[PDB]
Point group: D3
Chain length 201, copies 6
Amino acid sequence: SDPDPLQDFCVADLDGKAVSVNGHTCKPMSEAGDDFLFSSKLTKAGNTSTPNGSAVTELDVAEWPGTNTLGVSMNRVDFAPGGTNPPHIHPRATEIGMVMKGELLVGILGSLDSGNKLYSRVVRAGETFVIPRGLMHFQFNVGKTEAYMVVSFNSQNPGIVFVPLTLFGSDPPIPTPVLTKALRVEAGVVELLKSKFAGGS
Amino acid sequence: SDPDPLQDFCVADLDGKAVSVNGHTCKPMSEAGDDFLFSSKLTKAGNTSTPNGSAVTELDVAEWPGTNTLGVSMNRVDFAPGGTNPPHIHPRATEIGMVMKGELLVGILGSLDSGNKLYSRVVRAGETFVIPRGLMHFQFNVGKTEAYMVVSFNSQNPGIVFVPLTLFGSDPPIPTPVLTKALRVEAGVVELLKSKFAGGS
Amino acid sequence: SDPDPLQDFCVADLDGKAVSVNGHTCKPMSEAGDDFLFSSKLTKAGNTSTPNGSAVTELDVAEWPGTNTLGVSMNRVDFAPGGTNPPHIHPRATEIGMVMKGELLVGILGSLDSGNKLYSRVVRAGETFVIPRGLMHFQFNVGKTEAYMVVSFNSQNPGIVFVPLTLFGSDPPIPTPVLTKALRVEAGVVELLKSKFAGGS
Amino acid sequence: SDPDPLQDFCVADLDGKAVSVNGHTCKPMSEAGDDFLFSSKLTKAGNTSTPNGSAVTELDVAEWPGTNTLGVSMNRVDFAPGGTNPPHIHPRATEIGMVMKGELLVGILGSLDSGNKLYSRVVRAGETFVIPRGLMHFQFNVGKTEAYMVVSFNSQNPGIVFVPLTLFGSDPPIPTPVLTKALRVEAGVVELLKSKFAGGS
Amino acid sequence: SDPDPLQDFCVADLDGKAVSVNGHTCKPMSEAGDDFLFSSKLTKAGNTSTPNGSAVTELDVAEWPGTNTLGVSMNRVDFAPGGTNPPHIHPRATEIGMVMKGELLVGILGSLDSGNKLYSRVVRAGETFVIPRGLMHFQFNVGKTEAYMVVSFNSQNPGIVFVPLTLFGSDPPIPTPVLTKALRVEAGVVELLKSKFAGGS
Amino acid sequence: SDPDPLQDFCVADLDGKAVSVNGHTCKPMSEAGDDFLFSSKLTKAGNTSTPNGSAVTELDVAEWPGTNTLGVSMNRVDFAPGGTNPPHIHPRATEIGMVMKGELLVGILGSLDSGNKLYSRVVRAGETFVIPRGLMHFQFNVGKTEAYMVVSFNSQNPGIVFVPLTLFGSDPPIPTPVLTKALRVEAGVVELLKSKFAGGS
Ligand SMILES: *[C@@H]1O[C@H](CO)[C@@H](O)[C@H](O)[C@H]1NC(C)=O
Ligand SMILES: *[C@@H]1O[C@H](CO)[C@@H](O)[C@H](O)[C@H]1NC(C)=O
Ligand SMILES: *[C@@H]1O[C@H](CO)[C@@H](O)[C@H](O)[C@H]1NC(C)=O
Ligand SMILES: *[C@@H]1O[C@H](CO)[C@@H](O)[C@H](O)[C@H]1NC(C)=O
Ligand SMILES: *[C@@H]1O[C@H](CO)[C@@H](O)[C@H](O)[C@H]1NC(C)=O
Ligand SMILES: *[C@@H]1O[C@H](CO)[C@@H](O)[C@H](O)[C@H]1NC(C)=O
Ligand SMILES: [Mn+2]
Ligand SMILES: [Mn+2]
Ligand SMILES: [Mn+2]
Ligand SMILES: [Mn+2]
Ligand SMILES: [Mn+2]
Ligand SMILES: [Mn+2]
């Protein structure tokens, strides 16, 4: 997991000209102010009018620099009815979350050794779920109303590997011959899938 | 922080006769069932009719054995008007939280090297705070209504060191001459404070 | 990464009745024998007559119990001409590898913050590649001959999340409405893809 | 615990104008000299004429920059007769110590899960004690003569949270209404306690 | 470094029949007693009438089971005049030490990247030294009186690799042709050196 | 082990004027290029005409800057007939390797607690070995032809402590009186050994 802190506070210096290190260099304490341990960025619902039908409002170290070195971060996800936060992976964190409003099918997938078992249930207000580091998982709004959840991670920068978008719309895309062999379907089907992710989102 | 996991899942075997190790031994996967990644324990408010005027509903590994090895846990805290979750420390985790309802003064205290500086603000619905591992902190309900928050930790078992309860109601209590020297007051004041925590809570 | 060792040696006790812990309990040293630090399991090529056109011969802790607690493991992958080791993720390890024979296209994909960039090149005998923990990656045999590679991980049990198999052949499968929303195609296309992975491999 | 080192030596560059990171940037080896692995700062007794009746002579990374990245530090504590090193916490390290001269009552307090149990004994010359990371603990000189101890930590910068001083004399102090609720006594008692710590030490 | 603890206390169960794990299984708290955080084993000087002319009194987890999971241990080393604690390595810990009596030459050796540089000085009462994890180091009594030091490690079980004993008195010994090639001397010189360590100490 | 990464990529900035930190500062991604995850430095055999009769071709972070933060590295070792990679230690990594050509005696030595036990066998093409962090080990070419192996480490910078060279040819060398006491032979023998390593290699 994230390296442990070596002092009380180390607010990320996010200036583009700052020297680059594992994580982020820190602001001198004299420039950190009094409010760095606090945020209000998650008070408002994200706009769910996206191809997925969900919106992620991130509160990683880039959005909450006071989390730098502390080994944690958060985000909020809002869902239109029938919207999905599609199969995805966090390369560097386990996730722990609570549904705040609505009804969300939450699915978590074991690795090959676990027989690729799918664990899932419809999670409602006040109910929680946990997703081990690096495993594929998703959420899907099964209700008629807008739903949302708030989640936390044991990393300042968990990362997100969106499976459909990286499989079909990476920069540049994976060669079609690789995907026809891997997906066991003809080039026409692979190209149809590529066509849906051509815009980079 | 918590040791990283060495497999996908390892549900804590909480049987009193189980061999003891750092953390917990695990249930065989055949006996884990399908629901271990999920909990509903935080759906209901805790009873705030306590001396503190708050109630902690824990979702550590003891209450959510599916978190075993995963490096995370949660809890919920409810507050009566004027209620406090008193100055306390988590010995083994950073805390990251969101106020869900009401108005909570949240205070976070730096160590000696940070000049014992107090960082505080009134945190309202949807707003968040972060508490570095091992630092003293508190919450206080400054509103007229009941308030609650939901918090996460980067440990399955963060621990709680309540400052007033530990100082005055440890088992056995700290000798009075130690406390008179440390607190710079007469024995009468120390014995008064001890009398308020004589039940171990 | 994997927890550090707390003694010189701790050979995994792989008996089905052994108590379960994070990782594995260990054989008493009296029963470990003299050969546990050594293996010959990767001397022979795997059978590439598979749908993928590749074969993985694993040398994780299950196959090499002497690696228990040591923070490392290996495997070998053999490829038929035109064969793929399909897009996949290791949830708990960085991978570092060398191509031993043939010509392999090796592709490594950044996360969302890296713009889902695809880094790739054709890697030949004696040439090497490195794959950060949790990132999607693949290999494809672009040569006319059989190819093979030998790779190492900074975990005793890196895990493997095969993207096509997990998306379409999980147990149970991900519901079709989740996949139609995520993949931006009709149910017919999703059910076609499911049919190709219906045997769980 | 502290992040592991990534090279042999990395002497802290403690210049006030140096870029800030988790821990400290390092001096080039050409500027480190030949003596960085050694210190003589603990050869002399600290002056015990302080309100606590003890003096801490620190040998953390700020005083011994050669410890940077190495995951260890030390200090010496001297005690007047009847003097205390008051209830305190190290947020980022376990402590391991030896009494060198005199008779010191050493007390270590479990967390809530341990029933806030107090473990204690009078520790004499050559005898040792260990204090788990983040737990409240104290020392008290029960002898008629000056006493001292030398302790080590598994961090370059363990930190110190002095319980009485941060509870009553933080910058700014915790609001009195918070403390009356938490300590279960009247405002007059809280103000008396505050008055003893008003100077910041 | 050592895995972090997942609870307050976990006293090593050192029974020969206990299940084996990374580190040690733990005594139930009901059986731990009240004294596990304390030791008196280092109060007395070791017998320096040895070939080395020094004696190590160990306080690792085997001798102080209360250190289990806590990431620390200690030992004491006593020296006859002209005695050595010979060139050695700790495979799993940084060492931090203080000379308590006498005059000890302490030498610390950089790795190949550090040009195998030897850092050394004569360390006297109250003076300290630090040895990075895995590096070769030694002590030698240059005084006319008996000397002793007390050292701490950031591991419960640092391990000791004695260079002369391992090179010449391993069980079984390293083959003579390996040592003649490595040491650049004839078989006669190697067999002479082997003869000095033929008892395994 | 090496601190975990806090982002996808962080290519080492190896400019001599760069600020120094634990590990290495990183190049901005705009300057990293497209090829940093790949190397061809191990395609060619090293020249085995050295006193040891072996050559190490390193692929640590200094030679493969793309490994920075990723917790892995590699090297290749080539052996003349009768050549040795002499008893040595990696202070910061376990090693996992495969013999590619020839016949190599591979020896691994336990610490004092393991009775300084020597584990060894002749390892041939495709066969593997594992060496726990910090333990002394060697390889010796028992065949009539040139042999080679390729190994990986769970560190970007494992380090190398060559036992004969640091014992006898450090900068400056260990004083002869220390070595006569430690090795249990006369000064003449110690000086003969020193004479073989006087050139610093
Ligand atoms: C999202 O924002 C767009 C652009 O402002 C707007 O047209 C749309 O109605 C919004 N959707 C929702 C669900 O609020
Ligand atoms: C809350 O606790 C108080 C005091 O113990 C008790 O009188 C009351 O019955 C409790 N309320 C509920 C709803 O159980
Ligand atoms: C390889 O696998 C195929 C398909 O299962 C099988 O027909 C063939 O016998 C296998 N080859 C060997 C050498 O076992
Ligand atoms: C400590 O120092 C002060 C100021 O120099 C001095 O007056 C006092 O006597 C000293 N106390 C002791 C115990 O040495
Ligand atoms: C110290 O060891 C020597 C050699 O084994 C022995 O003769 C002597 O009795 C020992 N001294 C004590 C005090 O036990
Ligand atoms: C190694 O290189 C040297 C110098 O170029 C050469 O003389 C020697 O023959 C080479 N040895 C081998 C075994 O290639
Ligand atoms: Mn997620
Ligand atoms: Mn808290
Ligand atoms: Mn892979
Ligand atoms: Mn302390
Ligand atoms: Mn040592
Ligand atoms: Mn090696």
